[PDB]
Design a protein around this ligand. Structure first.
Ligand SMILES: CCCCCCCCCCCCCCCCCC(=O)OC[C@H](CO[C@@H]1O[C@H](CO[C@H]2O[C@H](CO)[C@H](O)[C@H](O)[C@H]2O)[C@H](O)[C@H](O)[C@H]1O)OC(=O)CCCCCCCCCCCCCCCCC
Ligand SMILES: CCCCCCCCCCCCCCCCCC(=O)OC[C@H](CO[C@@H]1O[C@H](CO)[C@H](O)[C@H](O)[C@H]1O)OC(=O)CCCCCCCCCCCCCCCCC
Ligand SMILES: CCCCCCCCCCCCCCCC(=O)OC[C@H](CO[C@@H]1O[C@H](CS(=O)(=O)O)[C@@H](O)[C@H](O)[C@H]1O)OC(=O)CCCCCCCCCCCCCCC
Lengths: 185, 68, 154
């Protein structure tokens, strides 16, 4: 009745906590404590670093993460064994090992993204003859930040391979909501 | 025998890596005092004035001081 | 309906006598069929009493029911001692004895109000007496309750 142009997109409650303010989003390990951009911001405006810890862990918990289920009942045992059942020394050495492995896998993913840029240029030549031979740097950063679905990747690759159009990009993939199955999970 | 003793030594080394209290949150279900955990209070029968002296001496010995 | 003890006896009567008719009539020799044809009259009387609807309509039916239940519980009960045998035909001879039994316990569960309340009260009394016996046995032989329980005021 009161149709406001754009079809009303219902805004459901969030099911996952928003990612931390120290995150990178690129499979690279985050910093140890301080996210290193604070030094390029003014003091007493960096108050939102602890205001991320609050409302990421105390005051703005989504109610989909407070659901009690059989899977969460089982998973509490894993988390309890991790936190109060395993010594922090062994947790620290495992944390160092995971940090090194994640740095290595980030370097591997960065090299894979650069090779996908080269493949982007190749597929953009085969499909537009020889004219378009560039590649989309925004799509490169989109692949690096894991913002693309496999369907979007395949559609973009096919689009390059048979019409070119490097700077015509697929839509950004929405975040995956937390799955819920009644009392099971 | 070395395998059995090695299992016991691995458990002891895990406890050594636990070491102290660091890394563990305080727990509202498990306070550090069993009198807190249960409901144990002294009442009218049993408590007497001299008991303060005896309590002082026991607390001095438990803290480790040779004064009374 | 099936929510009262007298209703239980009535339903039972209906079921039994239906099986009786279906085992004798559906399956001085003709008296073996006449006495089983009367089982359907018994079922009709019990379906009448199933809604026992002003009670004064079914009061005289109840009186005739209990009086002829007493008469059947005389005749069939003294039948083996008077010469005739009952064990021969099970599927014929059974349901008349059964409906006479249910009829007599109807004249006991109806005459005195009874109801599920007295059954629950008797079950609770028996369980309560056995409970006090169990507590005494435990406190005297197994473990004193002053030892088992938690002494307060510490
Ligand atoms: C200079 C010192 C010399 C040694 C230091 C470095 C050398 C060797 C490092 C450890 C051995 C190899 C580690 C490789 C994989 C990590 C193992 C693991 O499963 O992963 C461990 C994870 C990672 O740590 C935590 O991990 C969290 C969860 O992230 C990850 O957690 C999991 C990682 O397994 C999942 O993969 C999940 O997908 C991913 O999100 C956080 O993100 C943080 O990274 C951090 O808090 O911990 C957990 O949850 C589990 C906690 C207990 C597991 C203990 C495993 C190993 C313990 C060795 C003890 C021997 C002591 C002698 C010293 C010599 C060492 C061999
Ligand atoms: C024969 C009949 C089928 C037999 C089995 C075949 C598997 C079917 C699953 C593929 C469907 C893909 C799809 O729906 O694309 C369509 C999806 C839809 O797209 C996404 O949808 C979301 C929901 O709205 C949001 O809109 C996102 O923005 C959008 O990107 O596109 C994607 O490719 C996203 C990722 C797909 C999810 C994982 C694929 C499942 C299979 C791999 C898992 C392996 C585990 C094995 C154990
Ligand atoms: C087949 C059965 C599959 C079970 C469901 C799989 C995915 C559900 C999910 O969101 O995983 C979320 C779980 C945590 O459960 C989450 O755990 C949360 C607490 S915490 O993350 O461990 O701090 C808890 O709040 C939340 O209710 C609980 O879902 O995160 C994982 O690490 C998944 C590992 C197992 C898969």
């Amino acid at each position: 009745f009161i149709s406001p142009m754009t079809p009303y997109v219902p805004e459901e409650e969030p099911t996952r906590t928003p990612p931390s303010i120290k995150d990178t989003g690129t499979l690279r390990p985050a910093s140890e404590w301080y996210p290193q951009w604070m030094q390029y911001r003014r003091r007493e405006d960096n108050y939102v670093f602890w205001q991320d810890k609050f409302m990421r862990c105390s005051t703005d918990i989504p109610w989909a993460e407070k659901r009690w289920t059989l899977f969460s009942t089982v998973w509490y045992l894993v988390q309890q064994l991790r936190f109060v059942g395993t010594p922090p020394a062994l947790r620290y050495v495992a944390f160092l090992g995971w940090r090194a492995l994640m740095f290595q896998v980030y370097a591997a993913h960065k090299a894979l993204v650069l090779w996908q840029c080269k493949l982007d240029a190749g597929l953009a030549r085969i499909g537009s003859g020889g004219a378009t031979a560039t590649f989309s740097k925004t799509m490169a950063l989109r692949r690096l930040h894991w913002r693309n679905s496999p369907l979007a990747e395949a559609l973009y690759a096919l689009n390059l391979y048979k019409t070119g159009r490097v700077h015509l990009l697929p839509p950004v993939a929405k975040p995956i909501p937390r799955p819920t199955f009644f009392w099971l999970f | 025998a070395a395998v059995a003793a090695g299992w016991h030594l691995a458990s002891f080394a895990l406890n050594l890596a636990f070491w102290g209290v660091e890394g563990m949150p305080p727990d509202r279900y498990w306070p550090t005092s069993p009198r807190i955990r249960l409901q144990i209070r002294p009442g009218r029968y049993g408590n007497m004035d001299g008991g303060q002296r005896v309590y002082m001496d026991y607390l001095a010995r438990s803290e480790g001081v040779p004064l009374n | 309906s099936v929510s009262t003890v007298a209703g239980l006896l009535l339903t039972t009567t209906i079921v039994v006598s239906l099986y009786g008719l279906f085992a004798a009539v559906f399956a001085a020799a003709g008296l073996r069929r006449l006495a089983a044809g009367g089982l359907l009259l018994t079922a009709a009387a019990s379906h009448g009493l199933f809604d026992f609807p002003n009670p004064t309509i079914y009061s005289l039916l109840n009186l005739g029911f209990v009086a002829a239940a007493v008469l059947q519980s005389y005749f069939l009960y003294i039948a083996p001692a008077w010469g005739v045998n009952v064990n021969w035909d099970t599927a014929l001879w059974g349901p008349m004895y059964g409906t006479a039994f249910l009829g007599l316990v109807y004249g006991l569960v109806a005459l005195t109000k009874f109801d599920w309340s007295s059954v629950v009260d008797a079950v609770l009394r028996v369980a309560c007496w056995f409970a006090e016996l169990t507590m005494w046995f435990w406190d005297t032989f197994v473990w004193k309750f002053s030892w088992s329980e938690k002494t307060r005021r510490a």
